[PDB]
Write a protein that binds this ligand. Structure first.
Ligand SMILES: *[C@@H]1O[C@H](CO)[C@@H](O[C@@H]2O[C@H](CO)[C@@H](O[C@@H]3O[C@H](CO)[C@@H](O[C@H]4O[C@H](CO)[C@@H](O)[C@H](O[C@H]5O[C@H](CO)[C@@H](O)[C@H](O)[C@@H]5O)[C@@H]4O)[C@H](O)[C@@H]3O)[C@H](O)[C@H]2NC(C)=O)[C@H](O)[C@H]1NC(C)=O
Ligand SMILES: *[C@@H]1O[C@H](CO)[C@@H](O[C@@H]2O[C@H](CO)[C@@H](O[C@@H]3O[C@H](CO)[C@@H](O[C@H]4O[C@H](CO)[C@@H](O)[C@H](O)[C@@H]4O)[C@H](O)[C@@H]3O)[C@H](O)[C@H]2NC(C)=O)[C@H](O)[C@H]1NC(C)=O
Ligand SMILES: *[C@@H]1O[C@H](CO)[C@@H](O[C@@H]2O[C@H](CO)[C@@H](O[C@@H]3O[C@H](CO)[C@@H](O)[C@H](O)[C@@H]3O)[C@H](O)[C@H]2NC(C)=O)[C@H](O)[C@H]1NC(C)=O
Ligand SMILES: *[C@@H]1O[C@H](CO)[C@@H](O[C@@H]2O[C@H](CO)[C@@H](O)[C@H](O)[C@H]2NC(C)=O)[C@H](O)[C@H]1NC(C)=O
Ligand SMILES: *[C@@H]1O[C@H](CO)[C@@H](O[C@@H]2O[C@H](CO)[C@@H](O)[C@H](O)[C@H]2NC(C)=O)[C@H](O)[C@H]1NC(C)=O
Ligand SMILES: *[C@@H]1O[C@H](CO)[C@@H](O[C@@H]2O[C@H](CO)[C@@H](O)[C@H](O)[C@H]2NC(C)=O)[C@H](O)[C@H]1NC(C)=O
Ligand SMILES: [Fe+3]
Ligand SMILES: [Fe+3]
Lengths: 348, 348
């Protein structure tokens, strides 16, 4: 138990992880499963040590006994002097994104509309919007709010997966990993852009990164960010530049989780793996780049500078925050998770 | 599914249930329908979990296999050293009410007069009076005993709905929910207090709470209990103070019902929701008051202290009393309702 076993979600993340493994000199090793839930189970079983997770998936990890180790830190706005690994994290902005053309679409008219989600149980994709919808309507029938959606991880037969497109061969529709066309921050924005859905629940950063020649890929090549607007809670629409006052909520940053008996080991190993393969480390881009992907947002968000430290060994609760923990728990009163039920049974 | 789905009857109850959901953090959720019967269908099919029913409606729910969970308890007449939840449940007094200026009018000259009813199938408004009238005239022809009525829930083409006024714009005449200005205890009494009717079938408490400056509603603002008499079975009229000597019968109190499989979960959640939002709850009146209405008697009677444990898991027969069940059963021999016929096979 000196090798750190990384859990990779789907085959695209498996490739990057294999590459990482070789260059690490087996200091880091790979297990795979097809979903993040499946990977959380591997860590519980001891068939893997760690992966990097959306705050939403950190809630599942936490309820099953896992702890946060290090957080994603992206480019800040100020305090450039302090070292990235010591520089306090900020936390992204969950926004609802429409095409300006879609006329008279506000927060207050989303009922019966078409939705694109990162995946079920992710913070910007699901917890935040569906938390607010459920609370506003006083109804747990979130599964019938949108006429149709692509929400990878949902029931593949339901209206919540109706819009999902699968891989190149239209196969594995709605499976929550990179191979599904509309999976993730990128996939959900691409679902809005190809006008398959009226609204997309992503983070502010995703909107910028795939408009005004900022991404090479074709679906996003010619996209211009005056053709997109942000929905605000009050009802108003605002330009994508207004996210600071037209966001649904502030999300905690994606973080690495492991068993509590492996945190310190995983911490120490990953700091060293960063100094090697991070943004400004000895062997990027010479050998291998840990925070860059052949496709997009594999193991870590491409927008990641470093993995940063946390204050005083925090619980998943302390990490995510009292308020976002109450919102998730409240939304989850409307659903049943076999994973959470198992974990309640075998952590009591 | 930890959420309890409450069934609100009509849009005024829906607004109160949405508030309740929000302040309970989705410990409670709202389904709605236009009528109590429709809501009993929702609970049967598991689309809703519970609602608070008049004893007449508890008989319909019981025949369709639902069980009583908790009973409404009002401020006792005597001294109770016990907590409201454990204090015994008294029962309310079913009375006939008239203007005193209606000379000649007794129990014995009711035939061919104008009646106001809380609604069809309710204990005081309907099962008590009409049961005695079918018994006493020896005829099933109770639909023609009064010349005209408001009895919300009856055939809106028949004379039983002739006097019903509906809502602001007189839409939804005779629908058995609070949009109908003459619906329920409040509505039946307002019907007598604007001389649309000659007799109103309500409970003792209804007259007190709406006479002698004791409500803010304009139709009631300037009512005097001296202007009203009570009809007794002996043929005499007495004042509203003689309710104990001048009542048609004793009604079992309104009670929450659910399916047998959700009863324990619904009991646990409600006992805790009234600790928070009941008469002496931490969060009433700052956040939400479970037993107050913007209008009147929404979800619960506004004169409800707490909801109170029953005996050991009773049935609808045990809760209602063999005497009332047989009085109801004999009145239903003269009539058919869809829900009783649909469910008849369950207990035959
Ligand atoms: C018909 O309908 C009507 C429904 O409105 C009924 O009228 C209502 O009846 C009740 C009484 O039956 C009234 O409510 C009472 O209000 C008093 C205070 O105003 C309240 O408190 C006293 O009662 C007992 C006495 O034992 C105790 O709980 C209290 O004692 C405590 O406090 C004192 C000091 O202040 C201490 O010394 C003691 O040691 C105790 O700590 C009080 O003395 C009553 O409990 C009760 O709620 C309603 O006001 C009245 N409603 C209206 C609007 O008029 C009527 O009963 C119905 N009739 C029938 C036959 O059912
Ligand atoms: C929404 O999402 C966007 C992410 O895609 C955010 O836009 C980015 O925001 C930062 C602004 O804080 C941009 O980073 C910049 O990068 C510069 C270097 O290339 C920085 O350094 C320069 O400026 C200062 C001078 O004071 C010094 O650090 C240094 O001397 C240097 O000259 C800039 O300071 C700046 O941070 C980033 O490029 C933006 N990305 C894109 C593609 O536009 C946006 O902030 C997010 N919105 C909210 C409200 O959070
Ligand atoms: C929504 O429902 C839940 C019920 O699931 C309420 O929270 C629960 O409330 C109980 C009793 O208040 C809590 O128990 C307390 O916890 C501590 C620590 O265990 C204990 O020592 C105390 O004596 C007390 O019993 C319980 O923790 C909690 N349960 C869960 C699952 O969170 C909540 O209050 C309800 N919210 C609203 C707004 O109604
Ligand atoms: C793999 O892990 C070990 C850390 O345990 C690294 O080995 C150390 O390397 C430095 C010089 O690079 C030595 O001075 C240390 O004494 C070594 N420690 C041990 C225990 O061998 C190694 O660098 C790592 N390799 C990669 C590719 O990350
Ligand atoms: C659920 O929604 C309601 C309103 O839509 C929120 O409750 C309001 O919040 C304010 C500020 O905290 C309270 O003071 C008001 O009393 C509430 N208004 C109403 C109409 O109830 C509630 O906080 C939301 N819950 C969550 C978790 O966001
Ligand atoms: C009216 O109701 C009375 C009861 O209030 C009925 O008389 C009872 O009938 C039962 C069986 O049918 C007898 O066993 C009891 O002895 C009677 N009770 C009393 C108190 O006398 C009567 O059948 C009803 N009559 C009509 C015409 O409906
Ligand atoms: Fe996220
Ligand atoms: Fe009643």
């Amino acid at each position: 138990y000196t090798r750190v076993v990384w859990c990779a979600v789907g085959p695209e993340e498996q490739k990057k992880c294999q590459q990482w493994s070789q260059q690490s000199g087996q200091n880091v090793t790979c297990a795979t499963a097809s979903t993040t839930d499946d990977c959380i189970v591997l860590v519980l079983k001891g068939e893997a040590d760690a992966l990097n997770l959306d705050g939403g998936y950190i809630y599942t990890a936490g309820k099953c006994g896992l702890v946060p180790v290090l957080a994603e830190n992206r480019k800040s706005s100020k305090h450039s002097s302090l070292d990235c690994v010591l520089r306090p994290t900020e936390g992204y902005l969950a926004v609802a994104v429409v095409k300006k053309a879609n006329e008279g679409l506000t927060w207050n008219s989303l009922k019966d509309k078409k939705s694109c989600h990162t995946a079920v149980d992710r913070t910007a994709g699901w917890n935040i919007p569906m938390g607010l919808i459920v609370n506003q309507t006083g109804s747990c029938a979130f599964d019938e709010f949108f006429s149709q959606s692509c929400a990878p991880g949902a029931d593949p037969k339901s209206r919540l997966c109706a819009l999902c497109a699968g891989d190149d061969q239209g196969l594995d529709k709605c499976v929550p990993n990179s191979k599904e066309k509309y999976y993730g921050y990128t996939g959900a924005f691409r679902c809005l852009a190809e006008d398959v859905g009226d609204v997309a629940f992503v983070k502010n950063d995703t909107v910028w990164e795939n408009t005004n020649g900022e991404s090479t890929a074709d679906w996003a090549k010619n996209l211009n960010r005056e053709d997109f607007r942000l929905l605000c809670l009050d009802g108003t629409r605002k330009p994508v530049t207004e996210a600071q006052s037209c966001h649904l909520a502030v999300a905690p940053n994606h973080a690495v989780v492991s068993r509590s008996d492996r945190a310190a080991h995983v911490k120490q190993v990953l700091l060293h793996q960063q100094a090697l393969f991070g943004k400004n480390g000895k062997n990027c881009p010479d050998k291998f780049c840990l925070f860059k992907s052949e496709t997009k947002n594999l193991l870590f968000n491409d927008n990641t500078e470093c993995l940063a430290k946390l204050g005083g060994r925090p619980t998943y609760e302390e990490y995510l925050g009292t308020e976002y923990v109450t919102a998730i728990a409240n939304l989850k009163k409307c659903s049943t998770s076999p994973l959470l039920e198992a974990c309640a049974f075998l952590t009591r």
